Each structure stands twice: as C-alpha cells, then as structure tokens.
Amino acid sequence: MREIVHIQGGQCGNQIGAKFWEVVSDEHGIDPTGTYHGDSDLQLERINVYFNEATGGRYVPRAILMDLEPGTMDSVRSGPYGQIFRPDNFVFGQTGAGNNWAKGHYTEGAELIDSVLDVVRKEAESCDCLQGFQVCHSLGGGTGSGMGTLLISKIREEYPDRMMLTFSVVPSPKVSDTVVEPYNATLSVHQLVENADECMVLDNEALYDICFRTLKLTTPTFGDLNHLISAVMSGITCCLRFPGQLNADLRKLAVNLIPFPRLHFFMVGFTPLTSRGSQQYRALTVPELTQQMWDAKNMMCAADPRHGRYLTASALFRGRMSTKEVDEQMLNVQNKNSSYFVEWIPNNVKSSVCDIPPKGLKMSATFIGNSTAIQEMFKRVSEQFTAMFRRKAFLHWYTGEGMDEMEFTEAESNMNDLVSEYQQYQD
C-alpha cells in the first residue's frame, strides 16, 4: 500500500514509460487489454503500488502522460500496451515545445501546468498512502526538461514529505541529438538539485555500448534502449511490488545512498545482461554477477567509474539467493580495490535481497552507484555551456520567451558549485 504516482514528460519520457508499463505489467501478468492472467498469488498481492482497481477486473496504471506534441501520444496509443492508460490522464497541449527550455517552462507552461496538477492531485488523493513520484524525462530536450522541472518544482511544494525519483537522459559527449543540449541540461540540472530528492542519470552512449559489447545486438532501436532503462525501473521497486528477505523500498535507498542533499545523482547498471549466444555458457551465480555489477562498461552512464571514488553504492539483488555472497562479494569488492572507494565511509557498498526474481530469469540484480566520477559529465556540459554563452549563441530564441541573461549565469554558477563539491570529497 506504498503507492507511486508515475508521470511521463516529453517525447523521450513518453517512450521510456511506454516500455516501462509494458515490462512491469508483464511481471505482474496484466495483458494489453487490462485483465489479469498471472499464475501466482504473489503477483496480485501488491498491485496497488502501480495500478488502480476498476470495475470488472480492469486495472489502470497511476500514469500521467504529458508532452506538447500530439505525435507522441499517437505513438504510445498505436503501440502495444497503449490502451491500458486512463483517457483522462492524457493531458497535454497542441503548440509543441520545439526543444526550447524557456518555452517549456514559461510561456505555454502557464496554461499546461494548471490542468496537469488537477490530474496529479486526483491520482494522489485517490490512494491511501503515498510513497513518492516516479517521473521520467530527458535533459537534452525541451518538452520534458523545461516542462518536467516546472512540474517537479510545483509538485514538491505541494508534497514535500514524499520522495521524487526522477530518470534523466543526459546529453552525450560523443554525439548530440539537439544543438541546444548544453542550454537545456544546465538549466534543468539547476532545477533538479533543489527539487528532486534523488536522480538516476541515464544516457544513450552508455546504453549503445552495452547493446553492442555485452548484448551484441545487431540493430539497437529506441525500443531496445527503452527496455534497458525500464528493466531498472522495475528492479528499483522490486521490494515494493514483491515481498523480500531484506526489504529496501524507495526511501530505504534514499537515506543510504545520499550523504549530502546536493549529491543525489546516480550511475546505474542492470547486472545479468547476456547475449543470445552466451546464454548457456554463463552460469548465473552471485560472484560472477558481482563482477558484471562492478564492470565499468556495464554502467548505464558515460562517466567512467575508474576515474573517481565511489561514495556510496547500493545493490538490489533479486531471486532465491543466500546472503553471504550478497555480503562477502560486496566485502570482496572493497578489499580488492579500496582506492576506488571513499575512505571516510566504512563499507561504502550496500545490498538488499528480494526473493521474487523477474519473469523467466533465475538471478538478477540492479546496481545504484553514487560516485564522484560523475563530475566530468557535469564538467563537460558546463564546459560546453560556457563556450556558447560567451558568444551568446542560440540565446535570442531563449530570451524571447522571457528568460533574462541573469538566470543563465545562475544556472552555470550552480554547475561550477556542484562540480567542485564532487571534487571536494574526491581529494
């Protein structure tokens, strides 16, 4: 009865949650029509966390789909598992953000955010107890970045005692899908530090390397990329939807992983990723699950774990597992390379066990890492921002909606403050 209200924002946010509700319903056994077809009583024991019971056995998710372009709601509706959402929850506008953070936050945000909070407060007041809100967006765009951070700042004022689990697709170092990626990111991270309680940093270039090195996928589409992040999002809340030996819900990981309020960005990895060829060869045991857990390439963030020390890391083990290899392997990763861990925290790493595995897989685990090596990800975007800001490139569009030049300086000032704080504890 620890409910989570899910919000999807923007083109990327709608697509990542489209595969998210496809996976979590397949774990719980709901068909695309809406009925229940699972073979276990434990699947239906905790369905209140992500679904609302309706008349006739229908289950509706606690999902609010929001954007500004009606093309993506055509994409999620025409796609599979797209009929399960509430038609009243399809709140959005018609103007389109156009990858402008200022338009997504200031001009059309005034008319949009009034209607969306009515849908969100309807979902929150319906359930008896709230655990938090799970939002998903990107930081390179404007439809989910500016609009999402406007929503997150507004929803934390209304509900300050509930956690905010956000999923962000940050811009790539190697490539760039949008030209104004440093402008969108540095303003969005300036809003995420004080509103979001913790953030899980995602990016395509780490997912692309995983889809080619470990998974060995020939044609990784965005549907392929969406399943990797969505497999995490089921695994984070595994102790909520299922009973476990050592339960760890969304507030358990919050106090464990976060030393200071400004330091709440994580690098995330899903452990049992195998190719189709190497399914029979790899033996699913905990010690080989731990080495894939702590592999730098298996991290779904482009920041390299070898460059910086880990402050606190957590593991969400799933399956019928005994708890020495849960603990000794997390002890062994400390003594094998103690230089890569923060000295003033004894036993930086962390673990918990849920005895219900995912569908068809014996052992699984989800890794959350709060390391100081993510500073170069924020250092690079800040470096990319100051190059453009000095020449005032691509700014006459942003100042058109009503953003003065002072707010861009304040956003960059927080980036240098945040990147120095990570370097403060690295020394």
């Binding site: 397949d26 996928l217 068809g360």
Partner: protein, 90 residues
C-alpha cells in the same frame, strides 16, 4: 499514420528473449564473436579437405585401439602391402 518500423534482419522485436532467459540460442546469430566488426556466422568457406576426402581416416580410431575389440609399408619403406605378384592357382 503509424508506418511500420524497420523489420529486424533476424526477427527480433522486443529483446525479451535476449534480456530474459527464454529461447537460448547458438553462439552464432550475434553481432560479433571476435573483438569488433566481425560477423560470427559469416566466415571462410570450408572445402571438404584431404582428411575427409581420402576416406574415413581420423586418428581417433588409431589412438582408441578399437581394432582388438591400413599399413602404408611393410618391411622396406618402398613397397606397400597387398600389391605384388598375381597369385596363380594350379
């Protein structure tokens, strides 16, 4: 109007069979089995070869010693057995 997405070359739509343990597969049908930029299923064509062409000869039968349950030469290195004079009856 949702036009069809580009079809996969090997009929893979949702990677549920890849991420989950259902439908295990052969070490082929992957992107690379070497380091990078190598097709695993597409390699050098294999001719029948001399060992398979010249009868059944492999060293498993000679090493395993299954004869109890041919010779190249007998005596001098030059000659071979069962090739000699024609036997004449009466």
């Amino acid at each position: 109007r949702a036009v069809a997405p580009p079809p996969d070359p090997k009929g893979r739509r949702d990677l549920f069979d890849v991420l989950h343990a259902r439908s295990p597969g052969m070490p082929a049908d992957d992107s690379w089995l070497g380091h990078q930029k190598i097709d695993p299923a597409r390699g050098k064509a294999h001719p029948p070869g001399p060992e398979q062409s010249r009868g059944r000869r492999d060293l498993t039968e000679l090493f395993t010693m299954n004869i109890l349950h041919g010779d190249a030469w007998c005596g001098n290195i030059l000659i071979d057995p069962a090739r000699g004079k024609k036997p004449v009856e009466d």
